[PDB]
Amino acid sequence: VHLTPEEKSAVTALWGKVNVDEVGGEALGRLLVVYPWTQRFFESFGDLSTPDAVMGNPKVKAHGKKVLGAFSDGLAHLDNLKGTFATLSELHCDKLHVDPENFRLLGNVLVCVLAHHFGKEFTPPVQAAYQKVVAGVANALAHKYH
Amino acid sequence: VHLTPEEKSAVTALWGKVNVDEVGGEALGRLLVVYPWTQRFFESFGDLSTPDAVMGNPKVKAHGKKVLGAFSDGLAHLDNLKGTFATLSELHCDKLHVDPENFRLLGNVLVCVLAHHFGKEFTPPVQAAYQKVVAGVANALAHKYH
Amino acid sequence: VLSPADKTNVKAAWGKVGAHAGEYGAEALERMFLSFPTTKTYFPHFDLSHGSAQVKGHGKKVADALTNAVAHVDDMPNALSALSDLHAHKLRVDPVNFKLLSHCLLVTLAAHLPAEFTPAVHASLDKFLASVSTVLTSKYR
Amino acid sequence: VLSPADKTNVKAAWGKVGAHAGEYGAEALERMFLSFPTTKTYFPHFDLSHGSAQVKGHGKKVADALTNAVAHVDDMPNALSALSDLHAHKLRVDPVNFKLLSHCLLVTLAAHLPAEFTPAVHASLDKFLASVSTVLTSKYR
Ligand code: HEM
Ligand code: HEM
Ligand code: HEM
Ligand code: HEM
Ligand SMILES: *Cc1c(O)cccc1OCc1cccc(CO[N+](=O)[O-])n1
Ligand SMILES: *Cc1c(O)cccc1OCc1cccc(CO[N+](=O)[O-])n1
């Protein structure tokens, strides 16, 4: 809840080009690989012993698609991030006790994946506008701690 | 913040013995020494060049006393920490751009000082009640980011 | 990265703990479980009621590793290799929990060794614990 | 703490930067200044306008120091002692700013080298920059 009109335009246009069937699993997969302790929260997901097992785990890719849908929900409701995520905030904060610094990490992993797939088109201005998206999502998901 | 009636009695009892001329200055002083980057916010305070200079600094002692008085005010209004600190949050968030992790560091530095001063009277359940307070204070100060 | 001064601050201050190692280890564990109840989820098989013999003996194991880490401050990765495999590979502890325990250790030392707990020593001890924490949470084998 | 494979991944990926050091270094800084405007206050006397020759010249210094850090990955505190004087003793840089610059470097690397930015290499570069960041923000003399 803090985006200028030109930042909303830039994030909406880029997101219309996002493959919402692959980007979620790529980001959840990299979160599990780059920050290994987060695998502890996904003990029922099966094989997570190597980068290849993680990125090829079909439960990781299926759940990442749910992640990305909820990020899509937030992008269509950019001025009401608190309410869009309130119920997920209860689950992540009151039931799962994921420390909120992990919400920041996933948001930034997602930013790296967007850069990875778009190359030169993920320009410093597009990145900066997306930095306020993922920071608002992290903040919203941490609301039940607040 | 949810303190039981027995936690509030023991928080109140300990706080009424606190040395209001020294405890705040020691907490702010230890913050500037243990986390030296925080000195960047206090350039006009004079000599911060060594530990001894920081702790003896009269501007540090005077500023720490005002920090302690805000915590006193949050103790008196546990039911409404957000309204109690609304303008300090504007100052610290909108004007100073203090990163919220620093709020938690000061809260825990204060806890260490309480333990330093009161010794074994600073029991673990007394610590547990104090951690809820400083987490409460620290959350209310970060609200202008929320 | 500790300075030579950090190292001498930490040895002197932790030298004072002496035979209270297990008492202080247990106290710091109890401080962490009471103040930050989610840290308990790493010890579901433990008896965590106050004064538990299991926590007490585990506190002693923690302080002794700290005592060992002080003596090997200049080759932490070799010395801490076994505890790193436990905490990073097998247990996968979230780093925020190391900050909470570290803070409860500082609280314990301040409450018992007020003359040792100087602003400079407080800073070196915080850095020592942050450095041990980093090694225990890194998968470097 | 870096594993042998982390060092292998870092050396191989950064070697692919090559002549694009200052270009990528400058691009990271401009991402950082723009995504996180508070970082500009560490450079109050700089010309931070887009494309400014000063930021180019400064981005090249960053990348060259990183190149130096890659080659001295097993000798970090000694090789980086002067940069730690600057950032930790003189500029007292808040460590969260190092996470921001490190993230912006990763973004730049992913934008320019998509084939080499694999999950495993991503994870090694993150730890490498976190390791360089720890050294630059700690006062160890
Ligand atoms: C920051 C943005 C995040 C978003 C948008 C997000 C979104 C979601 C969604 C939509 C669900 C499914 C809820 C349901 O179907 O009931 C979920 C579940 C879950 N999340 Fe996240 N999440 C985020 C961050 C994280 C992080 C950082 C972690 C841990 C490191 C985490 C741990 C989990 C776990 C363990 C589950 C349950 C998986 C299961 O069913 O076993 N989340 N999340
Ligand atoms: C987390 C608990 C904190 C509390 C309760 C607190 C309280 C206060 C109070 C009462 C003032 C005086 C404002 C006035 O009288 O107008 C103040 C000012 C200030 N605070 Fe804090 N503060 C906290 C954290 C921090 C931190 C962590 C930093 C920096 C790292 C910081 C930076 C400043 C600065 C620069 C000023 C202005 C000093 C001056 O120029 O006069 N605050 N704070
Ligand atoms: C910060 C410094 C820490 C040190 C020095 C340390 C040291 C130790 C030691 C010596 C052991 C026993 C090894 C053995 O069984 O031979 C142990 C085990 C263990 N640690 Fe820690 N640890 C630290 C941090 C943490 C944290 C922050 C957590 C979680 C909040 C944690 C969770 C555990 C668990 C669950 C065990 C297994 C205990 C058992 O089942 O016997 N550790 N640690
Ligand atoms: C991987 C991380 C970093 C590396 C490798 C790095 C490296 C360097 C290098 C090589 C210089 C030039 C020093 C000289 O030539 O004398 C420098 C200067 C400087 N750096 Fe960084 N740095 C890093 C992170 C940061 C961050 C995050 C900030 C602030 C947000 C920062 C603030 C500064 C400042 C203020 C200067 C002084 C420039 C001047 O006033 O002339 N550094 N750094
Ligand atoms: C040095 C430091 C600081 O200041 C804060 C957090 C973490 C660290 O480093 C931890 C670390 C990493 C790798 C090796 C070592 C020990 O190196 N020596 O052998 O001295 N510590
Ligand atoms: C190893 C590590 C990790 O995983 C995360 C943050 C910081 C560190 O290490 C910091 C550090 C301290 C001392 C030395 C070094 C590397 O220098 N060497 O040449 O070993 N890193």
Author numbering:
A (entry chain D), B (entry chain B): 1 to 146
C (entry chain A), D (entry chain C): 1 to 141
Paper text:
Under hypoxic condition and/or when HbS molecules become deoxygenated, they polymerize into long, rigid fibers, causing sickling of red blood cells (RBCs). In this study, we have combined into one compound an NO therapeutic modality with the unique antisickling properties of two previously studied antisickling aromatic aldehydes, TD7 and VZHE039, forming the corresponding nitrate esters TD7-NO and VZHE039-NO, respectively.
As with the parent VZHE039 compound, two molecules of VZHE039-NO bind to the α-cleft of Hb, each molecule forming a Schiff base interaction between its aldehyde moiety and the N-terminal αVal1 amine in a symmetry-related fashion with the two α-subunits. The bound molecules are actually a mixture of VZHE039-NO and the hydrolyzed parent VZHE039 molecule in a ratio of 30 to 70%, both making similar interactions with the protein. The Schiff-base is strengthened by a hydrogen-bond interaction (2.5–2.6 Å) between the benzaldehyde hydroxyl and the αVal1 amine. Finally, there are extensive hydrophobic interactions between the two bound VZHE039-NO molecules, especially the pyridine rings that are expected to stabilize the compound’s binding to Hb. These interactions are all conserved in VZHE039, but while VZHE039-NO uses the nitro group to interact with the αF-helix, VZHE039 uses the methylhydroxyl group. The structure indicated that the intact nitrate ester compound binds similarly to VZHE039 at the α-cleft of R2-state Hb to make several interactions that stabilize the relaxed state Hb, suggesting that the intact nitrate ester molecule, as with the parent VZHE039, could prevent deoxygenation-induced sickling.
